[PDB]
Each structure stands twice: as structure tokens, then as C-alpha cells.
């Protein structure tokens, strides 16, 4: 099927400042941050959009922090609570009333082993779309 038009070329998630005392215990994390991927001008005949997520992951399985902060990972989930680690895919239905598709996602920082250290948090997740 023909591809829709990518509306969300860039999406920035600013976690802001997180303190080490709130990231000391294993499993501790930051608050959830809304992130949406939107497609438009979907051609007639194209009813499904599949997003493929890809990014550098560390030994924990989550997205590796390319920043200086140690013992910190990044997690991407859909609005249903399902984790979308690197290699994961998600399929949504196209809205034929507006010819668009949307991917309501959530992003947060977390420390799997706890003991997060001072430093920066940086990570980039690439998304590629397939249509049917």
C-alpha cells in the first residue's frame, strides 16, 4: 500500500532535572512524558501503519543512555503500558475520516540497578514506517 505523509519528523522529550535521591533504588524512574508520532495524507487503500523502533540498547534491554549519567536507561512504551524496546513494532489503524494515523507513546528514564549518578541524559530512537 502507498505510504502516508510523516508529520512528526522530530519529537523532543525533555525529562528536565532528575535528582539522584529519587533514582537510588532499583526500578526508580522519572515521570512519564507524552510523545506522539503523527502521519497525514494517507492515500485511500492504506488502512494500517506499522512503526518500527530502533535505538542503541544496553545490557538491560532498554535504550542506553548516551549521556554521562551512569546507571540510567530510557524506556519507551505505548499508551497501553507495553514496552517498545529496540526492534519492537506497533500497528495502528488509519482514521479514514481525516486520512491520518497517530502513535500515542510514553517515555521515561529509569535505573534498573539503581544508584544513578550525576550527569547528562541523552538518547535517540529512530522510527521507520511500513504501510498496508
Amino acid at each position: 500500500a502507498k505510504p502516508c505523509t510523516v508529520s512528526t519528523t522530530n519529537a523532543t522529550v525533555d525529562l528536565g532535572d532528575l535528582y539522584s535521591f529519587s533514582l537510588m533504588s532499583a526500578g526508580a524512574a522519572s515521570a512519564w512524558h507524552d510523545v506522539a508520532l503523527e502521519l497525514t495524507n494517507c492515500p485511500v487503500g492504506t488502512s494500517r501503519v506499522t512503526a518500527s523502533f530502533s535505538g542503541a540498547a544496553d545490557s538491560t534491554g532498554y535504550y542506553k543512555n548516551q549521556g554521562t549519567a551512569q546507571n540510567i536507561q530510557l524506556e519507551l512504551q505505548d499508551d497501553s503500558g507495553n514496552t517498545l524496546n529496540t526492534g519492537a513494532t506497533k500497528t495502528v489503524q488509519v482514521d479514514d475520516s481525516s486520512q491520518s494515523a497517530h502513535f500515542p507513546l510514553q517515555v521515561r528514564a529509569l535505573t534498573v540497578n539503581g544508584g544513578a549518578t550525576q550527569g547528562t541524559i541523552q538518547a535517540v530512537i529512530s522510527i521507520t514506517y511500513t504501510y498496508s
Binding site: 510523516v6 512528526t8 519528523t9 522530530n10 519529537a11 523532543t12 522529550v13 525533555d14 525529562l15 528536565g16 532535572d17 532528575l18 535528582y19 539522584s20 533514582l23 522519572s30 510523545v35 508520532l37 512503526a51 535504550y63 549521556g67 549519567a69 540510567i72 530510557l74 519507551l76 507513546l105 517515555v107 528514564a109 544513578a116 549518578t117 550525576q118 550527569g119 547528562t120 541524559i121 541523552q122 538518547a123 535517540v124 530512537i125 529512530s126 522510527i127 521507520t128 514506517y129
Partner: peptide, 11 residues
């Protein structure tokens, strides 16, 4: 097609 950039700091 899309890029999600995550940024922040740990104090």
C-alpha cells in the same frame, strides 16, 4: 522517518 530525542540531567 521519525526521530525521538530524549534529553535530561541527573543531579
Amino acid at each position: 522517518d521519525s526521530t525521538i530525542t530524549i534529553r535530561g540531567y541527573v543531579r
